[PDB]
Amino acid sequence: PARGTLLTSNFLTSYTRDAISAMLASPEQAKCNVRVAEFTYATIGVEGEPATASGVLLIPGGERCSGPYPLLGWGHPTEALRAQEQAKEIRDAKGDDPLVTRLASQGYVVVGSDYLGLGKSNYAYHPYLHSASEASATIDAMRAARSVLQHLKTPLSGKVMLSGYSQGGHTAMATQREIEAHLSKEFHLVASAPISGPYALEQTFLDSWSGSNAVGEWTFGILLGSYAIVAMQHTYKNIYLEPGQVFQDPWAAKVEPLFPGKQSLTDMFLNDTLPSIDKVKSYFQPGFYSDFPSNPANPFRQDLARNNLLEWAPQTPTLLCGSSNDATVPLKNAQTAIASFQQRGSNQVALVDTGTGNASDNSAFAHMLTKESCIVVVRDQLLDKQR
Template sequence: MRIVYFIFFLLNSFLLMAQSSTPILVSYELVRTYTKEALQQKWKEQGVPQAVAPVRYSIDVYEIIYRTKWHDGSTIQASGLYFVPIDTTKEERMPMVCYHHGTQIKRDRKVRLGGEQAICVGFAADGYLVARPDYIGLGKGEKKHLYHHVPTQSGASMDLLRAIKELNPRIGVVQNDLLFATGYSQGGHATMGFHKTVQEAYSDEFKITASAPMSGAYDLAGVQEETMFKEYSHPGYLPYLFFSFQEVYGFYENISEIFKAPYDTILPPLYKGKHSMGYINRLIPSVPKDVIRPEVVEQYLANDDFPFKKALRENSVHDWKPEQPVLLCYCQADEQVSYKNSLVAYEQMKANGSELVRIKHVNKHLGHNDCAMFAVMHTKMFFDSFRKGSKKGNAGPLTKRFLIGIGKSSVAKKAKKRRRLRAKALATQE
């Protein structure tokens, strides 16, 4: 009998240790409720047709604090938002969307009906559960954000989904078997990395139904690398990558070995999470490489094994073979993320033998920000098709696509007019 008790003790101790090392829910708080009527009114004010973005539910928004892993394997806390349709039947099982947001450098994150949170609300209003990780180091999380670092981005997403799985019984939510992943800009890269990571290492735990990465820098060491050496709308992205990868890989002992004066002293305080990317962009040269020491640039160009270049390759996410459907959305006039990222990813995945990847050129005239809303609409129609029984996904109803096309044409005309006016103003200045 003593042996039986001893074995039971060992098993129990093992289970407790396993649980203590597993990232779990720390806390949750209901922080906002959007009523169906208020959302319908908001959509009406913004000219969003109910036929394109139906509002069928009110929504509760929870802020979640949970445990995840820092790049060295230690346990830290991260945060995220959870959007839950609330006026459902008790028996209703809902699909899950893991939404990955775009580049954010300010640590603080408010809960508001705007920006990419409005995208999450749009999904939830039509019956999707939506998990929105802040990533590591943003929101109310610990440490610093590791920009475009695939392992921690993917880990933050998986651990939020694990925390939500623990939370759902407490708030009376039942999830079905459909799991989608999407995101825009950095979120496109994070989505692709999440899907790739799950397929390669966590497919026993997570069953992805489909993903839709949108306008992401998938080929960091190839296509997106070109932005370093020419006039670029967002030169602040490059130091963000350097600071993040320096934290993980430890290229140099001192940051002044990377950045030339005066940027070796100007830049570090700007990336503490209190300034916007727009503010940073205005303080540094428009050609990103011009903040870097010339000898570092020369080494980067001459040596394929240069540490930063190797880090970019390691965190590129275009070269793999998806085993679940993938929809890549992009706009050709994107000034922040080269549309060629999507083309390269699509062609490489097809070359690797994937028959489940498809590509959607949303519009040739829309820039990065304007492209987002329409890319999301195509993504939602793609996801909706799985809810209706499709196995590989489709483009959605013709009527919806027609209405979206009208909206795209209107916004594209305004975008072209803005570009003409900017070009005329620049010509006048010269």
């Protein structure tokens, strides 16, 4: 089956313009009714082998919202719950989601892949922070989405845009690079707005390895680092023969089934499935813990490096958004990327900060606040302008 082939499609629910505006009240007003659809499609694995995936499709409509519509590919954040489907999540949230309230309701067709290994995908695991598969899944999601839209006769302007939050920011940028390098004709990319992503992936881990970074305590580091380690092992299989070489007991034996698994990241954090960051030295094996920051050839580190999104020249107008208060994914990521881009001949990438400006508001928890905050900002400062 060709990449992007639509396997199944299905409408889930709908939301009137007024319903959405009511939600916003909780003072922006919706402009479009929003139809929520779900679908599965054919794509590829990390080795290029055939694979399936699922995705969400938000279609705007209404007398005050005639097309043509721009196509926005979206990258969701870190997801540990293997069965999680964005489309059903939105439906289960009565449509109260920024993708619906802030974008689709404003005339943007939103397409998001659940990623390999999640939702209805048939992949054995999720290649967390793996640029290539984050991009392939996203690309193929838009391809399948377009078959659906073509069948529904939804008028598309032809304009394509990208955005994503947290892991989704990495995803968004990874897709941008891929499209710009090889798919400029198929996808007329006019705007890219990665939100709070670890573009300088290797750098992010190195800076917070101790348990904290210049911004604050890397509170969720044990959950994110373990997901990254496990995922990178499944993908490159060069980190360990068995979990014990990296993780101390009794974690080693329960770490792989968790990423992804029967628990959401919030479940794990609240029920302390894994130790808190202050106990990082009690979690990782001593050898591994010290070798990582001092050996660039460390396997996990090389795997992180292969997934940095720094060595290239962005062609598409890009607005990196985040918050200086973010201690989970430091806005430093945005600064390093932009620095690398410029010395490569590109001046297409700009940065926008939504922080309070007070080092006092610094918190790993400020990360979640940037999602909807940055959606509105990048939407107004870049997306609407490139429409």
